[PDB]
Amino acid sequence: LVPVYIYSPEYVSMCDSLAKIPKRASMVHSLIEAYALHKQMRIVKPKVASMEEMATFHTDAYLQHLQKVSQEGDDDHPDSIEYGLGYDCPATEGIFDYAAAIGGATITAAQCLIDGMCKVAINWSGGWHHAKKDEASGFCYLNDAVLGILRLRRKFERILYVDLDLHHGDGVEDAFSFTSKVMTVSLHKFSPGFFPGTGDVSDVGLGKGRYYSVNVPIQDGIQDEKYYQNCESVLKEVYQAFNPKAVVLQLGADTIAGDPMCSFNMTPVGIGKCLKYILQWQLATLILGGGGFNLANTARCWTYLTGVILGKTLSSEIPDHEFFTAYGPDYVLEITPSCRPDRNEPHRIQQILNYIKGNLKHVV
Amino acid sequence: RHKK
Ligand SMILES: *Nc1ccc2c(C)cc(=O)oc2c1
């Protein structure tokens, strides 16, 4: 009944090599360790995803190109543009080994849930939800979330994917757009010009998977209370209609106040309440990270959320550790929202919610 | 295609 914590020193070093989030994995782990939370969890060393395992979602053409430019570090390949490699997703040396490590880590967590070893499995270095079957996107080279869901499908008939990242979980949604075995729910910023540009409330999936995709478009400046009440109402309707047997939860911390993207205005407490509501279901739950570009804040958030999973109240004061100096000037766990308005009109929020309720009536 |  103790939650599983996917970790190994080699795995963290690997994830630290991401150009878009250097050293973030170490900061997250070190803070968790500093709070001694790892002693309350079962530490499981992740295995590397094999080519075949990765091929359960990604095409062989993409995987082979990815591996090819990875060994070379060739950032000037004429095929890379169509495969989504570029500014957002550079051809870093060893990028294939990196992506294979993250994919395997999420698969390992999923396998732990299948084997009944735990009810909660955690991979904070995962949650790369933008990657498509044949295209890298939004700092995501391999979609470990999809890989994890496909693994869970071996044991669980219906899987609910919840995406609380700042950005639309388009890669995961696209992967299961035509199926009713997996329902995707994404709460995200939706505004013209904002990546990835998709995920309106009118997007509900296709074919047999119609109405099995849920999108909650949100505007800038949303804070804990409005977000949670909006999240709870949606999740309540979703749970009733879909009746999931397993949950995959993406918890990208780029929604948190202090993030350089400066869009949402959340604190880890608000996200924590959404987490608590999901954990209340007592289902097999796979926890993933994702976005988060204020590194210290992301560590603050995921450490706090780890405490939520463990049902522990963490000390407000950041304990001394390797990256202690990065937590100035206040050196506390709590995060203060910024003093900017919430661009979300209450009538529009209720309007979106009613639209979703209308869609979920078709889910039987 | 958007930039992230
Ligand atoms: N999509 C996106 C947005 C901003 C970025 C910065 C500031 C740096 C970088 O290397 O990549 C970015 C990608």
Ligand SMILES: [K+]
């Ligand atoms: K999201």
Ligand SMILES: [K+]
């Ligand atoms: K679906």
Ligand SMILES: [Zn+2]
């Ligand atoms: Zn994001």
